[PDB]
Each structure stands twice: as structure tokens, then as C-alpha cells.
Curated annotation (Swiss-Prot), chain D:
The modification N6-succinyllysine is found at K12, K120, K316. It catalyses: beta-D-fructose 1,6-bisphosphate = D-glyceraldehyde 3-phosphate + dihydroxyacetone phosphate; beta-D-fructose 1-phosphate = D-glyceraldehyde + dihydroxyacetone phosphate. Changing W147R: In one subject with fructose intolerance; rare variant; America. One of its GO terms (molecular function) is ATPase binding. Belongs to the class I fructose-bisphosphate aldolase family. Changing A174D: In HFI; frequent mutation. This is Fructose-bisphosphate aldolase B. It is found in: Cytoplasm, Cytosol; Cytoplasm, Cytoskeleton, Microtubule organizing center, Centrosome, Centriolar satellite. It comes from Homo sapiens (Human). Changing C134R: In HFI; America; partial activity.
Length: 356, 360, 348, 345
């Protein structure tokens, strides 16, 4: 509250410049910020032991790919550890990435915490000392952050305490990052677990984005210097009905265009477990849906950009190339999807049609 | 909650089609819904008695204008009296408007009500009976409604209680229109009274808007089936900073693109006191503002479409012609401005250059 | 707003007096404000034609009772019509009651209205013109008002929209009434329909009270000048478990002590549906419940104070005495219950 | 959810019992949870070097006072370092207190954070990982917590954002304490800084509290196992109008009874800034105030119980008895004031 402006014109100019730079010409985001535990889950699928070193090795293969990768990839979100890791010749990754023209980002949330008196719902931690962490990250070469909330549809979820309380941690999160020069990505993911259908997700997704944006305003957040990583709108995991990229597209741009201000510059979708192929086909329909779409509609993918590469790697140095090839192909595909230019092409083996 | 949808797909299709038809090709709205008191203030300016007959005569001139007016005017908001008045031959005004291909709206709000413990802030009455009233008006040829809220800037204004309550009332109101096939026009006006500058206005307006839409969302309103009639972002009346349309537009378009969703099909500005030429220069500047503009940006003009015609009328039937040319001239200019093409020469036309219409 | 006080010290004094006057000493509230249709449902039970004369005749009997009765009833809520009716002699009922020592109140809401996009939830209508209406009633010798909201437990009810919207209308009405000297009686009723149990209603009643209060607070309503008429914590109508007055008391005072500020002078249960005997025992248990109870706990009953009286009247003049007797009886039981005396042991 | 209870009845039962036992018979709380910096200020006053030794030493005099202080003091708020500090004989202070029948509490908040876009307003940090800390503290002898939010009166403060956000932080914290068997003392202080008068402070005190309690209600906090530590209502510090204890009381009780729920078992007024005597007089009055008072009304004082003792100590070990005397004296005065039985003489 009121008068007493959160930011200078200059601060805004910087954050709006970073933000627009990452989704600039069909480019997207590679989401490599899996934590120790989450990355172990990934490495498990290819039966690779979750070691720091293995983690360092897979990331180094992805980050050392030809600078051309700049033409699909606008930023890369890193987990803390990886932010401080290095190459073979300790070139820190973060500098391998900045030098190729890629903007570096950082996971700033520190996970869930249960919210008592609720059907298993949570909020997210990490606001304590966030300012000071953001400043050091700004110093170490980071220009955007990521904060993920997780909301479920189930008996009595997403509760109100749940949507408002996760919308306000997001809003504090967003507020602090801006005071430090980082563009905040607000991730209010609504989890595809369960058997609801398309309309149900569409509705919850609309009620969750309306909360976020009003919280977001109550806390004086600067929409122009922010990015949204929403869930696309689909039926749940256990839904038996079958849907089309085009139906996911309508439901998804419908929901957004009723709740996401045109000032937000770019909307980069989470892929969450869709196969790589669907991730791409869906984003591509999203860019051709015949509705008002005032922002860039792009990707911030984690699994949809790294499954087939993980699989080609299998933890063997010897696979460097195949690993590289995979990620590059997914990366290009999502760039065309980002421009509504993708045509069923791209990666084809079971891992692209995988499901995650 | 949820899975209790408020509208069917076919009700949505109808409100969306209505709502877009009104702002379709640079068109705008003529806001002729001044109540008796308000209208009295207007006619007082031209020293004409505020008679139900004087009122019916000045509106007869305006609506009997050449057909071509439907190139500029996509809809016309009427005050209850007027919705039931007649031409000089017993032909109903609402039927004349409707045959010339112009959508008819009706003022649904019923004035303010003081908010106790507030520094002179109000809310707006009109929801009791609202449904039974829209139903009937729909039957009577009406396809859209208008509800005006009034917020001001001042010591302890606009408060949370006032913003909150006026958004909710707006909320109920838009809900109810939608259930009866009327497209709600939502007008949370921020008045220009006072000396704040543009930056302050812009901030209150972003504040007001964000509450409005979250509220409409709580109430399940169908945005696609709505129109928004807000104030342009300007300095207060008594502020002394002088600004440029272009400054006006940057503030306006900035605020609106951070709170009004892209699903709203059009936003028709009230002109609230701005000279006829200024309401034209501004709207025009808003259409060329280099920011995202997902929605039509047009006019819904009370005074700014009528100053000149009133003055020409003088309350004399022999002035019919002049009266109609004034009206038509501002209706066309406005529609060009709604398309970012009004390259007025600064207007000459005192009528058009002066403050406006027992305003304050 | 922020300074800009709602009311003066004197308005306050006035309203605070009204408020405490009506629940002053064990007494309670006769809710005779049934509406035309509602009142006819009551007449239908005893097979009497809903007619304005039938209605004026019934109340006439209830209001002509032995003065006394200002030692149990401290206020009587009337439906508009009844406010301007007479007795079999032009005496205006509103004068008969004043002169008996009883505060007369008016129903100010105007029934429900559907909230689109809800599972059949409603709001209430009535604020348009309320202010004007309030001024005249105050001038016609009404000192307090009543507005009922209805909330229900059901698939996705009560919704947050429902609760929020109902609490705000209630806050508008309550602010409005003070501005014209009535003390507003805030009635957010959680209907018993359905099969939920006690603890489900407790939870839903404690959430609805938190809402209303919060709103009253936003609307700068003067609580010390108010009165509440909440439902009692009970299992739903279709619940098959069975419970004890004392179990309804604990459920009820628990909820109320967690949400209704000690500044509200009195909370006056509605009974809607409970037999005459139960509304007296539960109120009674309510007053014996061992929690902290900063406010008077009492009744503001409609059926529970009249059902037997109607039965006795039968719409027959001849039945007058029987009729008053009954009403006079239930009114003492509940005064005594209001004091936690009512040694109970079943009455009529 | 809704339904899906936050606590079992057992859990309630314990939090309830702990909550009441602290305010049990006119008893109150010694707040010795000043941080290293704050304590520094207080020692600055008697001219003693802010030293963990000094700190440690000064508290050791207050906690070794005769057991009879448990007639007046129901619990003590410690700051982290101190929760693990020992006497001159290696006996941990918390055990010394626990053995004289005093319940021990831990500061949980972690200070302030700037709320951009506000006129100097803040929120409070400390929720990250708070649960695992709660549990740890529970295992180290702790039974209740403490979280201080600060609001002030000034140009555009306290704002909606400040209000709502501190309320939400308070709610969360309260909730997480309950989940781990501590009783959360909610502390929404309205700072006295500034020129405002009585009625103003009372108006903000009422808005802050209605916000505090609805948010605890959104967050399923169980009030019967909570305590509230609010400011009393008084004019601001630079306000020239003089007022009587009776005036402070009517304004404090008026506010409190309009917003704080009768379930809350006890309300323990911070005194911030009040002289020891004024803190006793005003609490006393508060207890005679002729309005409904469903809750004990006591103290949770820091300066008000230690000023005279600190001056007597003078950082001189030889002043051990004077030092304890003073402290003991205010603790009894406040205990009487918590029973509206204090009189000067």
C-alpha cells in the first residue's frame, strides 16, 4: 500500500528487458532445476544412481551443446548446486550458458509444507532470507527465478486456504525478486493427478489464476517484469476420455485469456509429465488457437525437453552425442511449437511418445 | 460453487455476439441515459426547461438522424423514461433505433447510497428486482445494460470498503444481466474531482480494476459477454500539471492492460467532463499507444457526443438540422478515433472546446 | 474509511440501550414476523384460511395477553403489515405492545434471490431504499430490525461466494439500521436440511460466523448495538444419530465462543423446526454449558412459542384463552431456559 | 480442506492445558527473549558491555530467584541462545525454570522484512522450516511459542497489505506451532510511535485484531490453545494529551472485547515503552474495567519487569540480591494487577 512506488523506471526497464528477452522469437526455457531428489527420480528411470557426479555429468552434456541452441532456448533455470558446478576444466556451467547467449535462472522456492486442516494440501517455503539470496544470485550472474506452487483437485482441494495462501507466497516471492533485479517466474501448477476431465481443470485453473493475479496486484508486483508458468489445461491423469491438442488448446487459452493480464509478456507452460511429443503438439495448437492471445505462449520444459536425451545417455560418457542430439531436437521442436510452426516431425522413438 | 455452470453454451454465444456487435468496426456507444436530474443540468446549460417533453424532443432529433449513424454508433443506452417514449408520430424510440441497426441498452443502476463510517463514499442501489426488470426489458427489445459506480480520490478515498462493496455490487449486477440475455456494461468510474496528478489516478484506477475483475470472477460472470466502461487515466480536475493525449494514453493503456482481461471484447470510455475534442484526441491516442491492446478501445460518450448538438438545438425545433449535424459530426470523429485515425486538425468549434455538462 | 466515524457517542448509547433492553433478564423474542405465505403455512397446519383478517386475529390474541408477559418477552418482531394493523378497536398493535413494556421490531429483508453459478444458493434482497424505510419505522415506534440470510450444507454449499455475499448484505443492512436508530438483529441461518451430523454443522456454523463478524467489522458496524440470531448447532434433519441437549449445547456454545465477540450483548437462538419442548431444553442446556459465555443467551422464536397456541385457537375466537395460555406458557419456559433455570422436566 | 481436522482432541487437550496454566492464577509472563541487539540497548542503559557473558549472567540472577516467583510468573519467553545456556553450575536455565514450575517458551519469529510499495512497512520472517524447529524445541523442554508482528500508525500505515500479510504470517505460524504441541502466543503489536491520540490507536487496534482473528480462522488455528499478546490502547508517544489508566483501560477492553474471541484463554499485554509503574497501573485498571472480559488479562512483560532490577545489578555480581528483589517486586505487583488488586502504598 499506497503512493510509495515499489520500483524505479530503471528497475522496470531492466526487468521488462530481461523478461522479454527469454521468450523473444519462439524461444523458451529449459527447466533443469530438478532438485537432488527429483533428479534421482529421473536418473532412476534410466537406472543411474543419483550421485552429484552423475547429475553433473548429464547437465554438462546438455549445457555444452552448440551455441546454435541459443535459437530455441531463451534461459535455463538451475537448481542451487548446479548453479555452482563446473565442466571438465572447471568452467562453471553458469558461465558456459551466459557466454552462449542464454539467460540463467534459479530455483528460489524450497518446497512444500503441509497446511493443517486440509485434505493433504500444502504451501511453499523459501521466503526467509530470499532477498539476500536473490542479491547474491544477481551478483553470481542470475537474472530470473522460479517458485513452484502445487495445487490438486481431490476431496475438498484446491481449498481456499490453499489457493489464497499459495497465491500470497508467490506474491511475496515475486515482490522480493523484483527488488533485486530478478524476473520472477510464478508457477501455480495445478497437478494433473486424478480422474477429473477437461472442464474441471479449466475451471480450477481459472480460479487459481484469478487469485494469483489479484494477490499479485495487492503486493504491487510489476507484471511486465514477470513470467507465468502455468499448467496447460487438460483432463487428469486418470481421466479416461481422450482429448486433442486442439481441445487442450481452446480450454487452455480460454482460461488464460480470462485471467492473465496482457501486461504479462510471456506464458511458458510446465509440461509435467506429458510425453515430449504431446508437450510440443499441445504448445503448437496453443499458438494457433483462434482467441485473443496478448502474450508470447512458449515452454519451460523439464521432462519434455530431457527424456529422450536421458535415455540416449543412459549414464555413459560415450553417448554424449546422442544425448546432445535429442535435447537439440526437442529444443528446436518446441521453438517451432512456440511459433505455431511445428508439424508432426521431431523425435520418434518410444521416449518422445513416452509419457512422464 | 463449481460444476454448477451459470450459463449454457448457447447463452454465452448470445451475449458474446451482442457484446462484440456493439464495438465492431470502430463503432461506439451513445450514452443518452441521463436521468431527469442529470438531463436537467444539461439543458440548464442551454437555458431550456427540463421538461419530459423537452427531453423527448432533443432525443427525437438525435435518434431520427440519418441511418448512416449506424456506421459510428453501435448501441445507445437509454434511461427508463426514454425507453418508452415516442417520436412525433407515435413511433417508439426503441423501435426507431432498432430498425436502423443500432443495439439498445438500458441504465439499470439506481443511484448511490452512502457508506457509513467512510469519508463521503457511496455504493449503488438497484439490485432488488433486477432480474424481473431485465427480463422485461429484454422482452422490450433491450440487449445490454449499464451500471455506474462512483469512486473518488481524497482524504481516505477510495477506501477498501468502498472499492470492495462497489465491485461486489457491480458483480451481482453483471451476474443478473447475464442470466437474462443482457450484456452488462460495467462502469466503475474513478472521478476526476480533485488535484491529484496522472500518476495517482493511474494507481487508483489499477486498484479499482483489479478488484472489479477478481470480483466478477468470484461471481462467475462471463467476461466474453461484458463491456467495460471505465475512466481514461487523467489528472484531477484541479490538478495544474498539463498533459498530452499521448501522456493520457500511456497511463490509460498501461493500467488497463495490467488489470482488464483479454476476454473482455471491448472497453468504451466514459468521457466524464473532457471537452468533445479532448474526448476525441484522447481516445485516438489510446488506439495508437504502443502497448498490448487485446480489446476494442472505443467510446461510450454522454457529453462528448452531445455538447455541440445541444447548443445548436437551443431547444428550438427549427434547429433540427444543425442539431443533427453536430451529433453526427462528433459520432463520426469518435469512430475514427476508435480506430486510431482521427487526425483532427485541433478542433475549432467553441461548443466542442469548452468544459462539459453540469459536470463538476 | 479511517476516522470518519460511523455514529456518535449518543447513537451508540441509544442503540446499546435498545440492544440490552430486549434480553434484559432472562427475556426473549417473539418472532411474529412471518410473511403472508409463511404465516399461511402455519395457518394451513390448523386448517385455517390464510386471510389478512385470520392473521390479524391470531396475533391480536397473542398481543393482547396479560401485561405480565413483559417479564418473559422483551421484544416482538413484526412483519410490515402487522405493524399497521389494529385490534377490534382501532388500537394499533404497535401501541398495545409498547404500552405493555415490549420493544417492537421489524422484519427488513425481502426474501431470497438466486446466486448464479451455485448449487441453488441465494442471497437476500432488501437494501434498495432500506434507509428510508428505516427512518419511517423508527418514526413509527420500531426500535430494532431483523434480516435473515439462509445458508445450507449440501454438495458444494455453503460456498464461499454464498457466505461472503450473504455476510456482506447483512453487514450493509446492519450498518444501515444504525444510521437510523434501529439495533439490527443479524440472522445468518444455517438450515438443518440434510443428513449431516453435529460436528459437520459446528464446523460450517463456525465458518459462517467468522465471516459475518469480519464483515460487520469492515462495515464499521457497532457490535454493542447489535443482536444475533444464529441457528443452534444440531445434526441435520435427516441425520440418523441422536444427541442430547447437553451435546447440542456444547457444540453450540463452542462455536459461538470462538466466533461472536463479547461486545455483542445478546445472541437469541432461532429454533425453526425444533419442537417447543426441545427449543426450551436446548436453550436451557445452552445456558448451563460450562464454556465462557460473555453474552446473554436467549430465544427469538416463532414456531416454538406459538405452535400450541395456534393449535388451541383453531382459528376460533372462542379459543382465545386457551390460545393465550399456551403462548404464555411457552414464553415462561423459555424465559427460565434463558436463565438456565428451567428445571425443565417436561411442561405441556 | 475443510472437515479433515487440524488437531485431535488429545492435541487440543494438551495445548489448552498449557495455554491456561500459564495465566492461571493471576499469573503472567516474563519476556526475557530480547535478542542480542535489543539486550545490547538495555545494557547500554546501565553501562555494561553487550556480552553473551553479561547477557548470560544477568538472566541467571533473574532465573535463580526464589521458587516463590512461581506465584506470579507462569512462564518465560527465551531467546534461542539462552534456551541452551547454563547457570554457574552447568545447570541449564530452562531446567532451572521448569523445576520451579515455570513453563518455558521460545521466540520463533525471525525479525522483519520490507514490504515493497509501502511507506516503510514490514512483515515478519521465520516460517521457513519452522515446524522442524518447533519439534526440536518441544524436545528441548519448550511448551509455547512467540511471534511478534509490528504495525505502525503513519502516512498510509498501517496498510491493507501490511495488515493482511502480517495476519497471514501470524496465522501460518500459529498453525505450525499447534501441529507440534507448542502454544502460539500471537503478538500483533501496534507500535506507539508518533503523534496520534488514543481513539486513533484504538481504531487501528481494532482493525488489526479483526484481521488477526479471521485469518487464524481461515487457517484452522485452535483458539482455546493460543494466547494473545497485544498492545494496550494508548496515545502515541509524541501525543501531548495526558490520559488516566482508566482511560487506557476502557479503550483497550473496548477494543479487545469487540474483536478477540472468548475462546482465547488469556491476553498478555506487552507494555513496550511504559514505565514499570504505569505498566502495573494500566494492567490493574484493565482488570477493573466495567465491560465483559471473557479472558484472563495479564502481563507478558520485558522492560516493565526488568528495569529496576537491571539498574540495581549494574552488571555487578555483588548486586545479586538487590537485582532479584526488584524483579521479584514487579513480578508481584503485576500479578496483583492481573487480579485488579494492585494498590500503590
Amino acid at each position: 500500500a499506497h503512493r510509495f512506488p515499489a520500483l524505479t523506471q530503471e528497475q522496470k526497464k531492466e526487468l521488462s528487458e530481461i523478461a522479454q528477452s527469454i521468450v523473444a522469437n519462439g524461444k523458451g526455457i529449459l527447466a533443469a532445476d530438478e532438485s537432488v531428489g527429483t533428479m534421482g527420480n529421473r536418473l532412476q528411470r534410466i537406472k543411474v544412481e543419483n550421485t552429484e557426479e552423475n547429475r553433473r555429468q548429464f547437465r554438462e552434456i546438455l549445457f555444452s551443446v552448440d551455441s546454435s541452441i541459443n535459437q530455441s532456448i531463451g534461459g535455463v533455470i538451475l537448481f542451487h548446486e548446479t548453479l555452482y558446478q563446473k565442466d571438465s576444466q572447471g568452467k562453471l556451467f553458469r558461465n558456459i550458458l551466459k557466454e552462449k547467449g542464454i539467460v540463467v535462472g534459479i530455483k528460489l522456492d524450497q518446497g512444500g509444507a503441509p497446511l493443517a486442516g486440509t485434505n493433504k494440501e500444502t504451501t511453499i517455503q523459501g521466503l526467509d532470507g530470499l532477498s539476500e539470496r536473490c542479491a547474491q544470485y544477481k551478483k553470481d550472474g542470475v537474472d530470473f527465478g522460479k517458485w513452484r506452487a502445487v495445487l490438486r483437485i481431490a476431496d475438498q482441494c484446491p481449498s481456499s486456504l490453499a489457493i489464497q495462501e499459495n497465491a500470497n507466497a508467490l506474491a511475496r516471492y515475486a515482490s522480493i525478486c523484483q527488488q533485486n533485479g530478478l524476473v520472477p517466474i510464478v508457477e501455480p501448477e495445478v497437478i494433473p493427478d486424478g480422474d477429473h476431465d477437461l472442464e474441471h481443470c479449466q475451471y480450477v485453473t481459472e480460479k487459481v489464476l484469478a487469485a494469483v493475479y489479484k494477490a499479485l496486484n495487492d503486493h504491487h508486483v510489476y507484471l511486465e517484469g514477470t513470467l507465468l508458468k502455468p499448467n496447460m489445461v487438460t483432463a487428469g491423469h486418470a481421466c479416461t476420455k481422450k482429448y486433442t491438442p486442439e481441445q487442450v488448446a481452446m480450454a487452455t487459452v480460454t482460461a488464460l485469456h480470462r485471467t492473465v493480464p496482457a501486461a504479462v509478456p510471456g506464458i511458458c507452460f510446465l509440461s509435467g509429465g506429458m510425453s515430449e511429443e504431446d508437450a510440443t503438439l499441445n504448445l503448437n495448437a496453443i499458438n494457433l488457437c483462434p482467441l485473443p492471445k496478448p502474450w508470447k505462449l512458449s515452454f519451460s520444459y523439464g521432462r519434455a525437453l530431457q527424456a529422450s536425451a536421458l535415455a540416449a545417455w543412459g549414464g555413459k560418457a560415450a553417448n554424449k552425442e546422442a544425448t546432445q542430439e535429442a535435447f537439440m531436437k526437442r529444443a528446436m521442436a518446441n521453438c517451432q511449437a512456440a511459433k505455431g510452426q511445428y508439424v508432426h516431425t521431431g523425435s520418434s522413438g518410444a521416449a518422445s511418445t513416452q509419457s512422464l
